[model samples]
Target: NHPLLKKILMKAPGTYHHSMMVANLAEACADKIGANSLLVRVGCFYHDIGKTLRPPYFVENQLQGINPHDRLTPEQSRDIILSHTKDGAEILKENHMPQPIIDIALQHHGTTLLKYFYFKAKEVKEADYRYSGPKPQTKEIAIINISDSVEAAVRSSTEPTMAKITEIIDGIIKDRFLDGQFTECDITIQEIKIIRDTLIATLNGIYH
Candidate 1:
């Protein structure tokens, strides 16, 4: 096992646990929508592993109100958050992970806006804190992006209900569409709907 995975399993068991569940949901959604479930699942499992590099600085691994990013510039914060894709891919490749898995890992965030960090930087002066992206050029990569976002959002809710979860998942898919994140990918609007529905059903089944 990767040292990161072991450390996450021990120190941030909740995050590790959520990753496993989301992997299953993403995989199942892929299968139902005629996408590559295995690719989504594999990517989901390794997506955030780079956080292990500075686990203590991350909110998911931290126990209190301290956010180390508060002390860093928005550009630096964005790099730390976005660097996970590159770092995780390198780790996977170093271990000889399959090419398809590595590809999904690298492209999962696509060229989607880093809204939180981007806006934060803009507040100071818009100088493009955005990442130089290797956007999701494939259907599987696109699906993982949406799946990861929906899963994380749903999980973070305080008292998630089925209706609320469905709304959240649908909103994410719609936001991605409006942002043109899915434009270059092979997934259809219909497929996006199916993915949203599948994620809602999976999450509700698990949490409610």
Candidate 2:
């Protein structure tokens, strides 16, 4: 575990730590709701491993004030973020990760909007910018996506509380649904509500 974990941890310690925390929250929530806990956990672990390919550019993995995307076109920025899924998937496959794990790595973000990049492009008359997505096809991918958003939002907070966390989770879910990111999946509104409740409960438990 140390050797394999070391490889990932070395790439970006902040991201590695963030990923672990998110995976813990996600797996626990999945288990409480009888969803795919193991799958969610596995996906969270490898979802951002592709940051190793372009570590300095991503804010989560960056140690400096410079944002590489600031100088690049929105399409280029979107490509960098979206490419991680396929890049991580390929790395996993080459390293003998099971197909189930690889699928989650490639699909966790689904076909969601690249809001920041899209808007940036729109300012430059390139409103068509978007990511190439595999769109989450499994319960695990959906769960991980929500967990990823929740964790990042919480971690980046100046003053996080249970209410704030819940709001963030709800907003992510609602936005994703409105964007039709989950239309191709089998998860229901009921299930999403349950997942949201589970996340709130878990986060409160951890913080309290």
Candidate 3:
């Protein structure tokens, strides 16, 4: 493992496996979407290194332990969780990682709002943060974004049936659409559907 990856494993071991799964998902998506699978795989390996900054707050890094989030106010929880995306970006930059990896980490979340804070709480905030995005500027970037979400979303589903897999992926894609996360990117509608379909099949294989 690279030092960064070693650091992630040490500080937040759960994220290490999560990134690996996301990378595998990303490589599959790249093949389906005709993006560069190699580069996309590389980006996914370190995409969530920012979680190391405050690993206890991210459920993935919580390692089935008590969720520290239960102790925090919604605003504090939201701020720390949202900061991971940008913090990942900065970690890549400070370590002199390739420009593309940094960009993927920054844009993978794609200006999407935190519905956790929105609906998970009885009260909500009026303002939103730029979780990460110029949207996705390239096909590979978009695939990274999709695979990042797909891996986590499907991994948590109660059942692994193909129908449930497709539903989860489709709803997430639609969320991205409504939030305008896909608008600036060059990914076509046809490609988006293909990504969705492939994710459904691919995730079903992994989960089932």
Candidate 4:
């Protein structure tokens, strides 16, 4: 019933579906760790609006096993993938979305490398493959970032056993931690662990 999300459901069904899962995970983790659950959920819901602009370019939106990446250079693919954060931010702003929602859309990826294409290129200055970012500056943005990664990680797993899910969640949080993504935010290490455990438990039920 929400207008923007309706556009997502119509134009980028896959991303909309993924966002729902991210919202669920984020809201739960936010509640457990004293962040604003509703804010995080709304942020998640609107974070990938940019993907709606070019649905076929993203893997989740390619429905017929036809990958546009197959025909594009890794650099080109990287550019397309990287645009979503900025584009989504722009779209959200134009829609008059709250600043917190815009921040989540912008910072969800947190300058993280598009490692798949980085490896595909067999070359990269890490900066070349990373999203440009101010990183996350709030607990809600940080939670959404973690939840986004945890949802994708679990969904992409071949067999999401509880142990593997735990490992995946831990590994993602560790990567973000070491990458200094949360340094700009107010989230604590303890809260990060809570987010990790929450994702693992939620995903175990969803993926099992």
Candidate 5:
């Protein structure tokens, strides 16, 4: 881990630890599908590094049960949260990190809308609540995107089981596919299935 990553764990232990879970999920998925396992894990490692910049703003870091967003407008909350992608990219760039890693930080959300804030903004423009993106363009990024969602969802599952883990992975891939998040990425539907199964198996091992 980099020096900044050490600070990230100290400041945002929840997501820092969450990122490790995602890295394992991604690496297993990559191995099963013959993608670049090393690259995928590396991408997953820093996907949320920007969250460290404002650790308290993210729910992961609010282990004491405080949500700072409750005090701000949905618009304010949306901007601060979505800024992680842009800010993370800049942080990686400033440190001369690999472009692929920076790209993962930048494109992981893939233009997905922040639905909670979108609805809360009281009819604000849809664009106002969405992550701006060039979208993911590689299989490694695609794997990271899916793994990130799976890890977060599974971590919060009250009744995690093989069936529930399957449901979590299925729903996220379907939603992202329907949302057109993977359209630009070179990952195929078959690979997506493999990634889903691989993640389910990995999560079972972790949570079982």
Candidate 6:
């Protein structure tokens, strides 16, 4: 659907496929709650464009257990992971994408901690491990954020089933809520429930 997307497919097929699933899931959430489905889907499509910049640095794009982080310190690993969002924003803006699309690239992680690297660093402070601030400022960005993680969490399961998928969706929604990821946006508690249910249904249909 986009020229850069074709490059993503060629350079990072795993991330390309992951974004496709995330777009499908986010659009369903948008539709169920009367949000701008088209805008959210398009945002999802380009949300992870920065992953293509350092394709192997991301787990999805790494094949045959080839992990690049092993050779680097946790701080170095954190920086590489954090740069994807910034890198993606630069790519989208350079392509003259709509502002909202560019926003998704920047806001998807919502200042969340890069927990794995955080723990690896064994640092008592999490300040350095988190993404750049300015969490999801809009409902579309919020939906894409949740959908992005939900797809990754569920996809990580070895034998995904309806119950397992539902559990993962609930846990992520609750985690995001407690983490205050949606506090900056207009998405309501009710809307979050609807998004959760829609994702459970959509993921069940696709994976189970």
TM-score of each: 0.86, 0.90, 0.92, 0.95, 0.95, 0.96
Instruction: List the global CA lDDT of all models.
Output: 0.74, 0.79, 0.81, 0.87, 0.86, 0.89
| CA deviation > 4 Å runs, candidate 6 | none
- Candidate 3: deviation at residue 201, Å? 2.0
For this target, which candidate reaches the highest lDDT against the unseen true structure? 6
Per-residue accuracy of model 3 over 85-172 as CA lDDT, tens digit each = 8899999999999998998888888777777775666643534544645678888888778778877776665656787777778888
Candidate 3: deviation at residue 152, Å?
Answer: 1.2
| Candidate 2 segments exceeding 4 Å error | 64-66, 124-128
Per-residue lDDT of candidate 6, residues 1-208 (tens digit): 5578899899999899999999999999999999999999888888999988789988788876789988999988998999999999999999999998899999999989889888977756888899995799998889998999999888767877788888888888888989888889898999998998899889878975
lDDT of 2 by residue, 1-208 (tens): 5565567788778778888998998898788778878778867888787777877766777655667777887778887887888898888888898898888878877766678887766564332454456778877778888888888888777678777887898899988888887877788788898888988988888788
What digit string (tens of lDDT, one per residue) describes model 4 on residues 27-145?
99998888898898888889999999889997667766688888889988998999999999999999898998898899999989888999988854889999998798898888888
Which digits, one per residue and each the tens of the lDDT, describe model 5 over residues 32-111? 88989998887777889899878888876775567888889887898898999999999899989999889999999889
In model 6, state the lDDT of residue 86. Answer: 90
| lDDT score, candidate 6, position 107 | 95
TM-score of 4: 0.95
Superposed by TM-score, candidate 3 places the C-alpha of residue 29 at a distance from the truth, in angstroms, of: 1.5
The CA-based lDDT of model 3 is what?
Answer: 0.81
RMSD of each: 2.4, 2.1, 1.8, 1.4, 1.4, 1.2
Residue 133, candidate 5: C-alpha displacement in angstroms: 1.2
Clashing pairs in 5: none
Worst ten-residue run, lDDT, model 6? Answer: 120-129
Candidate 3: stretches off by over 4 Å: 63-65, 120-126, 129-132
| Backbone collisions counted per model | 0, 0, 0, 0, 0, 0
lDDT of 1 by residue, 53-109 (tens): 666555556556767877898778877877877776887798788888777767777
